[PDB]
Ligand binder design. Structure first.
Ligand SMILES: Nc1ncnc2c1ncn2[C@@H]1O[C@H](COP(=O)(O)OP(=O)(O)O)[C@@H](O)[C@H]1O
Ligand SMILES: Nc1ncnc2c1ncn2[C@@H]1O[C@H](COP(=O)(O)OP(=O)(O)O)[C@@H](O)[C@H]1O
Ligand SMILES: [Mg+2]
Ligand SMILES: [Mg+2]
Ligand SMILES: [Mg+2]
Ligand SMILES: [Mg+2]
Lengths: 348, 348
């Protein structure tokens, strides 16, 4: 479900022609001027995990200099130590996966089947459960009440149209028109369980469901976040429409009714509660990219002190170009670009 | 979704060596001494609709005399006229289906695929949405509060374990181990939509869902039934656990808190509301088999007068051996067994 990033190592990956980075538990701050190669680090981490896509343009990741790339990630998931190695050289691609120090998967395909079964989530759901994009917090606070519920709906992925069963129940149907031309009955038994299923959703019931699965969860965590962040509100409600209702002393309040500082806390609390909800577990690692961008000096300070109260999450990686945030991290990874080649250094 | 039975015709079907029966809209009473061949009529109707099962013992339906059976059903579904013909003679079976007077399906298999797509439900769900077994009402009223919710859960079919995807996502997986031995990528695209789906239920969320889909529905109809049956209660609640709460003047009441007569009304109301819920539409036809069995003279009378108030359902077939119920029907189909052969006659 949720992992711990241990060590990434890249070769000819975009700006990083040769970089090795070790991550620690606690708060990790990847600090470096804009364009220095920070986001590529995690680009490499994600590429290591799900490799290239179908018909993927390998020029995007390979440092323009040559035609060869190699990334090695050491992560741990639910008590196990994994080492994923993904590489590509001149049209030749490969992938290997190790579990507790022994080979587990040796082929690009088997490595994927294994990775997918280790996380228990797909590429996108996993990405939303661990990576918080630049400006999310500021943008959330900018949206109008009705838009806030919108973004929550998105993060959860409510856009689901199981019409795929069309091709599904059919391509796996005709398979029997070749069984009727003078045992294989099982192939019917499941074509039914396909209808019995597609027959209970209708394309519009799948949403009514998700609101049932997530909302409960999100509200649970949102409340825990509140205690961790010391917000003065015993109960936080989350309507089935994703509206945040803070039960204050004199009556329910909406994020918009709160002070700048408290709004930051709630927004962070919500985005975290959602990440936990996507994986149905308390996240082990969360990566925030330039989370204080678009925030005035006041709200930056607030988030800074809130970061300091984050102890419920084992590993929190904050990427920034603001060096003041250095006073919040337990570890500091400086990144400097040297005329096209990134350099990483763990000091400060 | 829901049909109207027009005409059934059987040949060598159990007790009915040769019987032809026409049904009408309104209340139809199939009256006849125990063992006279009433339930076979509808056995034939159901057999006509879904034919024999896989490796089905044709001695059960074929009149013991010989080895040949033939059933022809004329029903209408959602504005269309259908004629289904199912037959079997000496190991040779066949099936034909006509829509609005023209051939539609000519092979046992194509006839099934067509029938299933016309009803929009499987054999069992359809059977619970149209056939109310003997003693259901009396038994329901006999059960203990906690058992009542139990039976509701059953009728809805909450027993669902999508673990079938095991064989599913796998038998349709290895299909690619034969694609990796030096386009067919689509076969992956849907193996994912299979996980993305099986990955959101977990075998225990599918129930939390059904309660969301049905309960709302059942409560809606239960209330309509109340008005049709003239019950003195503006609102009837149906908890997410399937408990019936009658909002009377002095406080909520449970079926058990009501008078014998009112309990019959509620039970009938509930079993009807469920049938509508299974097909997500107001039933067109409902068949009650010996619904007054196990009911004392009082409660029989009550149900009798309630039957008379049933106008919301286009066709209601009541099978019984009690001739007094004849005073409730718009049409009467007498059934007499003549030493092993049933005889049907529409008089009285
Ligand atoms: N394939 C590549 N080869 C060499 N350099 C690349 C390649 N792709 C991107 N870059 C360089 O990476 C730089 C960006 O690093 P950057 O992503 O801005 O780190 P951060 O996100 O922390 O600011 C760009 O300026 C670009 O020139
Ligand atoms: N294959 C068969 N051939 C001839 N008679 C049969 C066959 N199967 C069942 N029967 C007869 O049908 C009779 C039952 O008709 P029945 O179902 O009791 O009508 P109802 O249900 O309205 O009482 C049984 O007594 C049995 O002898
Ligand atoms: Mg960046
Ligand atoms: Mg920042
Ligand atoms: Mg009977
Ligand atoms: Mg009766």
């Amino acid at each position: 479900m949720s992992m711990i990033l241990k060590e990434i190592r890249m070769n000819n990956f975009k700006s990083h022609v040769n970089s090795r980075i070790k991550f620690e538990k606690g708060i990790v701050a990847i600090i470096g001027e804009n364009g220095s190669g920070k986001s590529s680090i995690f680009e490499a981490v994600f590429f290591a995990l799900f490799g290239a896509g179908s018909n993927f343009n390998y020029d995007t990741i390979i440092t323009k200099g040559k035609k060869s790339v190699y990334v090695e990630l050491d992560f741990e998931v639910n008590g196990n130590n994994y080492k994923i190695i993904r590489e590509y050289d001149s049209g030749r691609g490969g992938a290997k996966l190790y579990k507790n120090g022994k080979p587990y998967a040796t082929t690009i395909s088997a490595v994927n089947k294994a990775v997918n079964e280790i996380l228990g989530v797909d590429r996108n759901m996993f990405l939303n459960s661990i990576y918080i994009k630049q400006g999310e917090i500021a943008k959330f606070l900018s949206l109008k009440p009705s838009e806030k519920l919108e973004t929550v709906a998105k993060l959860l992925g409510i856009d689901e149209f199981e019409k795929c069963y069309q091709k599904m129940g059919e391509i796996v149907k005709e398979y029997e028109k070749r069984l009727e031309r003078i045992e294989k009955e099982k192939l019917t038994k499941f074509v039914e369980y396909l209808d019995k299923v597609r027959r209970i959703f209708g394309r519009n019931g799948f949403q009514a469901y998700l609101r049932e699965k997530y909302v409960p969860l999100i509200q649970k965590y949102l409340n825990e976040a509140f205690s961790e962040f010391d917000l003065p509100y015993s109960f936080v409600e989350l309507t089935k429409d994703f509206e945040v209702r803070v039960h204050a002393p004199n009556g329910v309040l909406t994020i918009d009714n709160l002070s700048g500082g408290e709004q930051i806390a709630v927004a962070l609390s919500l985005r975290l509660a959602i990440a936990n909800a996507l994986i149905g577990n308390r996240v082990e690692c969360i990566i925030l990219d330039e989370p204080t961008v678009y925030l005035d000096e006041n709200r930056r300070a607030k988030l800074a002190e809130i970061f300091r109260k984050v102890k419920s999450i084992p590993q929190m990686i904050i990427i920034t170009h603001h060096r003041e945030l250095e006073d919040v991290a337990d570890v500091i990874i400086n990144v400097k670009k040297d005329g096209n080649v990134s350099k990483v250094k763990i000091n400060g």
